[PDB]
């Protein structure tokens with residue numbers, strides 16, 4: 001099936017440079033105009049650039065004109081976005097998209113790759129637990145989770161029983177604490193009866209610091 | 220450019236909804252139709268296409284969605300709002316450079332009032348040893364979004380060591396969840412046995428409180 005995969009972003013400091021890429025699958029890459037779209041933290045959506053099939057025709061909004069450069073390698077069905085002289089405002093989620101011959105811009109979107117632009121320092125998260133000792137057992141269901149404390153930059157991915165616990169999962173969005181550090185909780189509610197047999201573990205992952213932490217939560 | 224009104228849109232299931240946009244200038248390309256499109260960004264996902272070229276439904280979009288518009292005003296209409304339709308809608312114009320998006324209209328599903336299941340999670344030793352221990356209070360699956368959370372350490376109103384994390388609406392039942400964390404240093408926390416989290420909600424007549432007894436082992 002058709003899909004796009006962006007990759008290559010992380011923490012870069014102001015004035016620096018980064019090159020995000022996007023890999024095409026499921027369609028004839030060379031037949032389509034490609035796009036680079038971004039969404040800022042305030043969820044504002046902005047168009048970044050486009051490039052013809054040959055690679056000779058491109059354009060960008062003034063806001064990114066001259067610092068950014070879009071390119072594509074038809075040979076490897078990849079699309080690239082060279083970013084230079086990064087500004088903090090450039091901090092966002094970068095998506096690559098494919099349109100329709102018919103007259104549509106973004107019919108297919110990727111997953112996105114988050115580019116953070118600051119003078120801050122990469123720090124791994126401390127995966128703490130939340131113990132449902134007693135003041136939570138309201139009967140035949142209680143809540144529990146792992147508090148992913150102190151980390152930067154975003155993002156941090158959390159999973160339960162490595163994907164073997166979908167429904168019930170409540171992973172809250174990150175909050176930029178005072179320390180300049182993010183923190184978030186991922187709670188889940190489960191039948192008090194499940195405890196013991198149902199081994200519950202949260203697998204945290206903060207790629208930006210190569211932190212791969214697992215934590216078994218229990219009664 | 221573009222202007223999208225309304226910002227928020229409370230709608231009941233089955234209801235009809237209308238979101239409109241007005242481009243700064245009459246939007247039309249090589250007369251090759253007006254290239255005005257509508258996107259739906261379901262929560263926690265990338266945006267997706269619904270209608271393009273003012274009214275063409277993209278493949279896979281159900282007919283409850285329709286588009287229209289003239290000169291500078293375009294409207295998206297949902298005849299029967301279903302649960303899956305919650306998220307933020309965006310209009311987009313590709314007839315002129317720069318290609319612009321509308322600021323967005325968040326569609327929230329109006330549901331029957333529900334009470335939050337409050338919970339209190341005291342700090343586990345593993346963070347206590349590290350020093351800073353945080354007590355989290357969970358207000359699970361409620362509606363509306365109006366919820367006040369006050370911290371009562373013994374009986375002190377902590378007007379500082381707390382933060383809030385509110386989720387987006389859940390398509391399974393149209394509820395929200397909220398988490399408030401009282402972040403204390405071993406000492407402050409260690410100094411008091413009981414910690415209370417007081418919840419006040421619309422479906423909550425008598426503001427429920429949630430407290431625990433401090434301990435160690």
Ligand SMILES: COC(=O)CCCCCCCCO[C@@H]1O[C@H](CO)[C@@H](O[C@@H]2O[C@H](CO)[C@H](O)[C@H](O)[C@H]2O[C@@H]2O[C@@H](C)[C@@H](O)[C@@H](O)[C@@H]2O)[C@H](O[C@@H]2O[C@@H](C)[C@@H](O)[C@@H](O)[C@@H]2O)[C@H]1NC(C)=O
Nearest residue numbers: 031032033050098099100101102103104105106249251313
């Ligand atoms: C089903 O099979 C396929 O889809 C296989 C792919 C199609 C076969 C090869 C097609 C070769 C032609 O490719 C088209 O070139 C056009 C330019 O000549 C593109 O249109 C341009 O898109 C730019 C980026 O947004 C910008 O909007 C330009 O203004 C626009 O050109 C304008 O519109 C054209 C349709 C012409 O009328 C031209 O005179 C005019 O200047 C095509 O891009 C598609 O259409 C545009 C409107 C936009 O919706 C893009 O996202 C679409 O992809 C391009 N076709 C493709 C599939 O890329």
